[PDB]
């Protein structure tokens, strides 16, 4: 719209804008690996870079964004996959990465272009996957490129299922199965069933609540210490008295 | 090839040394190759063990000391000029000409593998692993061993040569202008802008077969007769130019009847105070200024329109690659974004009566979950 | 930004899965396995029986842990230890009388 590179953001129902600053192509360097050493399960989504604003300035660290943008955050991370392959736009050409490691660089002339909205001359193949064995032995996840709109909504629906299963576990408790078992037994016994069930449910409630109370007390370090000191004193008293009566038993 | 079996043993490397493996720790045995259930009509495959499909793999790898599985797969292969290498439908490369061999003319082709890694066989007979039936006619078979798999194909002699360039587009209307010591070409038909040096290319020095020249003349005449014969005139003979990116452009300048008469009256006044339009086309400044303004405005209108359409199309491409690619190619295709570029392949059709849908979307093993779309067989 | 956050959430679930699928004994079994493999033939001859007895130890601890989680299981041991403490302190005080005179 403006006819130059600009940065834009949506502040609700209106847009905010500012100007971007250019950096020369020879002042940028790309790193050879996308793997994170401190946490083995994670990898970077896009390559890491180092650059300078001026030919003699200090180095700045970042991550390669879309369409030659240099991001300063290093926050695009994903879980590592198998069979990974990517081409990233870089200074009027492309850089090729495979299995989270660098390999070589290409010119924009090395790849064919779909130069019109319609063109039928493409000579495709019927692809056949050469799947890695780790997918079967170690249950590792197979790469699938960038997410599309259908894939994004498929994953959102999978995450809300996992949270729902967690909610069921924290809302419910182990006594529910016991109460259900007791209730199913008493309802089948009619009037006598209710006459006995009403008192049985009361005493069982008294037991589980009493156990919960003493269990809760031990959550406090002083509570845990008090019971620990009591049993330690009991052990000392027991072995002393046992050894003492053994003397009497001896003579 | 003889029976459809493998030896149940293999060589592997660990701790920088070679070691021998054995299927379930047992002795060398002929294992039968079985068809893969999920393989398409074309691009067939066979395996010796069911663990790739059966759920038993969750415990099998902890049940035996070692496993060995033999694989056989059919795949498409492609090679492009100069035919020094090829690719397989798996995404792998092979650094050898598909036309190479020990026969006449084949042995001089490009190769990057040692002499022991290649072997040729004459009078070979194929046998389908599915039907167990042998072929009716012999072929010449090439065999090559790559560090991760062996590959084989039927040999044939190198095919004849063809014209160096092929027609890409016939453009009914294309404006030309001069700027910064270079020519610039533009049209509404294609969003690309070609840039070229001012010197004309000597096509006759290379197109001795007239395979480019003849086709160009015929196309320009068809277009002229269809749209321009009643309203414009040809200024001069065709011209040839090599544009940046490796394109060859054949051009034919025109003048509208309404503009041509301005050159005529100027020439009549010039003759009165004292026809090859090619001599006059850029001499009368007072005529060219209105033209530069008028045509400059047309070129800018097309440029702004291309930017608008490309911007919408490139965003839709990210949301649904399959729909966008299928519309451009004119057939059903599968597509995927490998970062900043797109990968593609063909889909295979299935008849409507060979499909069955199930009656329920509920999952029995976990009561809280349901399928998003129906299950089929 | 939407797809960046979706990939960040599926990384967190993978880390949670890794923690619940694995268990504290895996590190012990790995340490033992590395020692017995390095020890050779004698290492295999000992390792095959060691894994059996260690299996007995961990399964016994799990066996009581599965009982201790039940309210009646927790109560039963609670009453037993309380009775044991009462018996111990009573007997200790009793022998203290004898020790005195």
Author numbering:
A (entry chain A): 554 to 804
B (entry chain C): 202 to 475, 501 to 603
C (entry chain B): 704 to 804
From the reporting publication:
The best conserved among them, glycoprotein B (gB), is essential as it performs membrane fusion by undergoing extensive rearrangements from a prefusion to postfusion conformation. Here we report a prefusion-specific nanobody against gB that is neutralizing with cross-species activity.
To ensure the stability of the prefusion conformation of gB even without a membrane environment, all four stabilizing mutations were combined in one construct. During processing, no classes showing gB in postfusion conformation were observed, demonstrating that the mutations fully stabilize the protein. We resolved the prefusion structure of stabilized gB at an overall resolution of 2.74 Å whereas the nanobody-bound structure reached 3 Å. The previously unresolved N-terminal region encompassing residues 90–106 forms a helix that is held in the groove between domain I (DI) and domain II (DII) of the preceding protomer that is formed by repositioning of a short loop region (amino acids 407–410) in the connection between β20 and αB33 in DII. By contrast, in prefusion HSV-1 gB, the three beta strands (β4, β5 and β11) are significantly (four to six residues) shorter. Fusion loop I therefore changes its length from four to 15 residues and ‘rolls up’, forming a short (2 turn 310) helix while keeping contact with the MPR by positioning W174, F175, Y179, F182 and M183 towards the hydrophobic cleft of the MPR. Alignment of our described fusion loop ‘rolled up’ form with the extended fusion loops of the postfusion conformation shows clashes of the latter with the MPR, in particular amino acids A261 and F262 of fusion loop II of the extended form.
